[PDB]
Write a structure and sequence with these properties.
The complex is a heterooctamer, with 2 copies of chain A, 2 copies of chain B (78 residues), 2 copies of chain C (94 residues) and 2 copies of chain D (109 residues). Chain A is mainly alpha-helical. Chain A has helices spanning 9-18, 28-39, 50-77, 85-95; strands at 47-48, 82-83. Helix content of chain A is 62%, strand content 4%. The longest helix of chain A is centred in the middle third of the chain and has 28 residues, at 50-77. In chain A, 27% of the residues are buried. Helices cover 73% and strands 2% of the residues of chain C. Chain C has helices spanning 8-18, 26-53, 61-71, 75-93; one strand at 58-59. Chain D has one domain: Histone, subunit A (Orthogonal Bundle). Chain D has helices spanning 8-12, 18-26, 38-63, 71-80, 83-87; strands at residues 33-34, 91-93. At the G-H interface, α1, α2, β1, α3 and β2 of G face α1, β1, α2, β2 and α3 of H. β1 of chain G pairs parallel with β2 of chain H, so a sheet runs across the interface. Chain A binds a DNA duplex (145 and 145 nucleotides) through residues 1-11, 13, 27-30, 47-50, 80-82. Chains C, H: Belongs to the histone H2B family. Chains C, H: The modification N6-acetyllysine is found at residue 55. Chains C, H: One of its GO terms (biological process) is defense response to Gram-positive bacterium.
DNA sequence: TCGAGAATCCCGGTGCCGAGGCCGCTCAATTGGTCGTAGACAGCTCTAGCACCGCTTAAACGCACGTACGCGCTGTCCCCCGCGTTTTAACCGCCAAGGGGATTACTCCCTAGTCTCCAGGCACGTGTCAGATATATACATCCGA
DNA sequence: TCGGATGTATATATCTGACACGTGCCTGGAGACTAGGGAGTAATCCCCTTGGCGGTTAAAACGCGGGGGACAGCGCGTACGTGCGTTTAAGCGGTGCTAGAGCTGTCTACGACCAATTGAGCGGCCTCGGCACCGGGATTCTCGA
């Protein structure tokens, strides 16, 4: 009979793995394409330095990680362990972004 | 259609660093919209700085100033 | 005895153009004074930072326009830019 | 013979003062030198914002059968607009109050 | 006896108090509290009359905003009563703790 | 003197906030939060008063102290 | 006969530069004139804060068997304190990561 | 070719005093540069506003001390004030 | 409470590229005088902040009852997690072209600083009308039979 | 569904004090002039950004099975809302004293500015050891009988 872990074990293993490293977690080329697509709506034929895209990606990852940290607190307050769109909405409303 | 380059595994890695144990299936579409709004806000100010400087290239200093103007100071790029 | 200054005269003159039959109280006048001073400080500080960034030593209408574009949201920015451009053009024309 | 004086506001077609703005810019330690069109631009922008706020407040005051304007009217005008509430989102207006709002789940069945 | 049901007078008071603009705390106790807190930083201090008014206005506005956030947290928990845990969550998300 | 802030006053503040039912342990927490906020503002106000070499605290000092913490107040000079 | 030169930092007993800080204060449009002791005071404060942060970061670096200091060590030193964490609360450090933290409700029974 | 300036030498001198056998990398050195610039700008702005409030035209060690007290929390402010006072006394002794 | 399995930790060796020190040199910081104003100190005038006493009444306090809301326990089902297989595109290395960022001269128009002269805006006093306040309806909303 | 009870909106009359407006005056803004350097424009150089091509392979996408977590429902009990009777202290008015804020006049020390002079800090080279990677074995945590 094959070996299987119970649900939740590998999730905690990944939490421990990623809370210890410091590397980026999104793909460079798709992120660059997205930045260049967004930039077209304000000016045409723009150029980007190499370090500008790195700075943008760093800021974006930090922002999303903080947002998820607050969403988890909302979900636990509701007596749950699964996060939800309403949790994200409540966190943003209290932070004042909406 | 470049917002689809941000994939479900990458969103899951970000959540795992945030400390989330279980995720529902409707989170990804919401996260994509949040990111799009944030990026629009920062990039508009960066382009305004570039246009005042009379350049055709966005630099790292423009991004740093744009982030600082929004209460999001960043270290290690200038 | 030293004397103070405010924007009460100009606020009243503006109000008499949009509502020729309305008054104002002292508390409301003080609130309007605070509003004007705060917006002035915001715009001036942003223009100073721009001049420092671009290694210039003069504050000009280009700096004021960029500061307005950075600070005001949406249609307010468009209308403010139009008013400023028209005023400067009229001032130069004379 | 010297020609008759003529204020800078009159030749700019404004109601806010240009000379006082120029003096405040010069004595505010913002730069080493100040150009000639900057006070005109700043005065025009300030006047436009004042006019917008005053129009909304006057409408609010007339809605509830009053002749004068009070801080309650100013607060209502500021909070009911979408851009002004974004511009003044960290500002407290004394003797202003709050907007009426009750959540849907609290009303009786 | 003409008892109203629980919850009617509360809504009536909400409607009454979201329409006025006056202060809701007693001025003499607030002044005494301000002086008592101030005496720890410096002795023999005097206050202008408008300084205490400014302090009171700021305090009331801050408390009203905090209660507004607490209500949303309590509703999110599928309740109608507010508890200290709701205030704690609101402050933690706002970043004051 | 913190006991001079009464249960009816806290109830009025909560009603203006828009709440319907209040638990019995809210009042002590509210008193603590108010005390912390007041200490934080008054410390800066007294620092401003001491720098100008005065014995009186003024509305200008209170307004500056409020502005330093992102709580700008209109209607008392400025 | 001009006497031998002597830096202001040496007279103050400091390692951070005083003349450069004086020039930066003069050319920053902060005031009309600058006193003589202000650059000395400011340099002393800056040196103190740098020394504190570096001591903590070096302890963090030695804790994990390294000789050099890296952004991860800087982040750990800043976040594990209480006062530096309050002074640098709205700041993002590149290549720093987060503090290990798991909620107790999520742990297995 | 223009040449730029930074605080790397002074940061290194400070490091060799508190940890005589530890090095540093380039990314960490950049982070330290950003830290020093940020604190400098904060304190200078606070002093400028104080001098403007008191209707003065000079920035002094008293203004710097008050700005430090307003900006730093708890024990950090006390230690920084002591360091600055000792440095000024030693400089004025010679 | 024990065995099997999968994952993580420890350790010895190789190899390379980035931190760390040295050299020339040029530009910014130091030293020595001179000058004019900003700020420090004393003296005086008068605002306003503090302390007290009597009284009227509106708010606070305390108690009793009951109803509705919070919270625990059960059962169902469907959705999200773990794992194996196939597919796709990200990443690295290397070539090639040219758009544009950056620096150096040259020249001129705009802004700072003075001096004279006058009108705009501030302090102050005065009269009347908008709004506050009391009383009497008239009407809308809740509650139990 | 409806009558009884209670709270709230509306109209009329009457007072009162704050707002809107003259009036005198004084200082700050405008008109006219001069001088010097900040910035606008043209030319040149070389760096760094963009585009293409191929190979390897790690990550992404898809399908299946099952277990546990979300959610609706029911029941019990006690905590908070509402109303009434007694007590306390805030708000208002008026007196009275002096501490300290605010302004003015003298005078002197300190910061700005300019001209010689020299050494500290930056850019450009080299070079060796701290760390990154690989492979092998040891220990630990999880899961089912």
């Amino acid at each position: 009979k094959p070996h299987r872990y119970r649900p939740g074990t590998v999730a905690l293993r990944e939490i421990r793995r990623y809370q210890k490293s410091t590397e980026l977690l999104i793909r460079k080329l798709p992120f660059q394409r997205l930045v260049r697509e967004i930039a077209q709506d304000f000016k045409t034929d723009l150029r980007f330095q190499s370090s500008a895209v790195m700075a943008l990606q760093e800021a974006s990852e930090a922002y999303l990680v903080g947002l998820f940290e607050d969403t988890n607190l909302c979900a636990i307050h509701a007596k749950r362990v699964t996060i939800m769109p309403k949790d994200i909405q409540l966190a943003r409303r209290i932070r004042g972004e909406r | 259609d470049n917002i689809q380059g941000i994939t479900k595994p990458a969103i899951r890695r970000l959540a795992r660093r945030g400390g989330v144990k279980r995720i529902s299936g409707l989170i990804y579409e919401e996260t994509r919209g949040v990111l799009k709004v944030f990026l629009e806000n920062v990039i508009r100010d960066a382009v305004t700085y570039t246009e005042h400087a009379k350049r055709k290239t966005v630099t790292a200093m423009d991004v740093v100033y744009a982030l600082k103007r929004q209460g999001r100071t960043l270290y290690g790029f200038g | 005895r030293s004397r103070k200054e405010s924007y009460s005269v100009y606020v009243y003159k503006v109000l008499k153009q949009v509502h020729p039959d309305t008054g104002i109280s002292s508390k409301a006048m003080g609130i309007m004074n605070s509003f004007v001073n705060d917006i002035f400080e915001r715009i001036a500080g942003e223009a100073s930072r721009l001049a420092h960034y671009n290694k210039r030593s003069t504050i000009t209408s280009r700096e004021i326009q960029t500061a307005v574009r950075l600070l005001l949201p949406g249609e307010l920015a468009k209308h403010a830019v139009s008013e400023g451009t028209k005023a400067v053009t009229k001032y130069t024309s004379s | 013979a010297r020609a008759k004086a003529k204020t800078r506001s009159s030749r700019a077609g404004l109601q806010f003062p240009v000379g006082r703005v120029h003096r405040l810019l010069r004595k505010g330690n913002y730069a080493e030198r100040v150009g000639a069109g900057a006070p005109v631009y700043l005065a025009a922008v300030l006047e436009y914002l004042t006019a917008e706020i005053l129009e909304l407040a006057g409408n609010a005051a007339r809605d509830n059968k009053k002749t004068r304007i009070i801080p309650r009217h100013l607060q209502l005008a500021i909070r009911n607009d979408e851009e002004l509430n974004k511009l003044l989102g960290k500002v407290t207006i004394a003797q202003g109050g709050v907007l009426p709002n009750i959540q849907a789940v609290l009303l009786p069945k």
